[PDB]
Amino acid sequence: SNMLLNYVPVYVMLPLGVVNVDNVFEDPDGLKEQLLQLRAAGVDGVMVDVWWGIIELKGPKQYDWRAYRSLLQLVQECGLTLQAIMSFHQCGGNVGDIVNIPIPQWVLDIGESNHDIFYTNRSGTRNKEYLTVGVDNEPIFHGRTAIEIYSDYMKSFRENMSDFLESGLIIDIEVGLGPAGQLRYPSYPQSQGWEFPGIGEFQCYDKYLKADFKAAVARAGHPEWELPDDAGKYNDVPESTGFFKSNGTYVTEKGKFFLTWYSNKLLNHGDQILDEANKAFLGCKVKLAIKVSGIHWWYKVENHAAELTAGYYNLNDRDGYRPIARMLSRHHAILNFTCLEMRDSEQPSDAKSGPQELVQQVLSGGWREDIRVAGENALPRYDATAYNQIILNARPQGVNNNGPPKLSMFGVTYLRLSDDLLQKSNFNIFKKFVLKMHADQDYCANPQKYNHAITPLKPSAPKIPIEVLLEATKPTLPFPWLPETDMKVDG
């Protein structure tokens, strides 16, 4: 009884391209066999990208939901729930992307005449994996703004998948908000030569964001201020730049204003799109969620350079994640994080990486703000060390034999279903992982039993002014973490 209240659900990401670029569900029989294995292993559900570039390929509002309806039907038949990602991004240029799925060609056609609809770096390179926040409210897509495109897409999904939603097949809607579906700037593009652990680059040089910034600095009484010109390039280290070096530009009035403006754009981008997601799924028995990327490199140095270029204005004396958690609260949304499997010792010393501390900060911030926090492993891992670290983060203070744990993640999604995962040894270890995540209890079909009942999505609470959101930048002590989990996959 008490142990079941400690149950943390486990989901598994489906293979990329399960539904191909031509909107065809290629191998249902193959997938079926895999899903049945997951079902027998105790997995609660699966996660899948519902690619915008596949669905609305033909043209504006020309949606084809047929292949995905077939996929959802199979998932339901196999007794698994689903986390559906509204993927308004391209698959192909990020780590692990083994299939190329661009955004709609008709959108790219518009991009040919207006290159500024894409995130742009100082050098002028255009990244076509996602539409810049700069055009969120620009009615340049055959009369629609980018946010309207996202809104219409989600509404169409809600209506065309109404039966699956009513039956409870979908656990949550992961609202894609940028590259790799994450609320972030494409500051570390492998497509432009970035290599870990480069500090990355600011991506606010498209004409819309640049004009936005210029107007902002003018209103601040400094019209002459320009975007950073001393931040170096993708593969630099912080000390080699005028912007991130000690006493550098990042701590000057100009630098602080820019960083605040830059990170604020993401806060409002997510807030505005979540407003549309709430409207689209209002009344549905599903929860909303967003994804925040885990930029752990340089976390251990004063400048947190990589986080800053990604859009997370997080420093040792400024919490850049709690404001995101606070923004999510009005939407009753889940903050889906990552790097749950990483240990600092596994990263190269020169990267000044702190994934363990970063995870502790983000999860603690979410709990401090009274919102649900879920997460994923950042990279493919099949070993016990990885699973034990995930289980530790899932319940930082262990299991409570007297009832529910004071601290527990809302769920964990494993990246990713593959042939390797299903191999004898790998899968046997994975089964132990599932068992421990479930607090040694057998798979529990009814989430209500472990206090995960889903009620109709209510309208979002009143808008929270930016000043109140930023009050959450006040540094706070993280919740204490055990050094190791009390539920290891082995002994």
Ligand SMILES: OC[C@H]1O[C@H](O[C@H]2[C@H](O)[C@@H](O)[C@@H](O[C@H]3[C@H](O)[C@@H](O)[C@@H](O[C@H]4[C@H](O)[C@@H](O)[C@@H](O[C@H]5[C@H](O)[C@@H](O)[C@@H](O)O[C@@H]5CO)O[C@@H]4CO)O[C@@H]3CO)O[C@@H]2CO)[C@H](O)[C@@H](O)[C@@H]1O
């Ligand atoms: O289907 C869902 C979704 O899947 C894919 O996106 C997911 C990413 O695959 C996943 O990594 C994560 O996104 C972030 C991640 O959170 C973040 O940490 C970062 O990843 C870093 C590593 O942390 C870092 O260690 C380094 O990895 C090196 C590694 O050190 C080295 O030893 C060797 O293994 O090479 C690795 C590759 O460089 O760099 C990576 C970045 O390259 O960035 C990730 C990407 O933003 O969560 C994503 C969302 O689920 C698909 O890409 C996406 O389209 C799908 O929607």
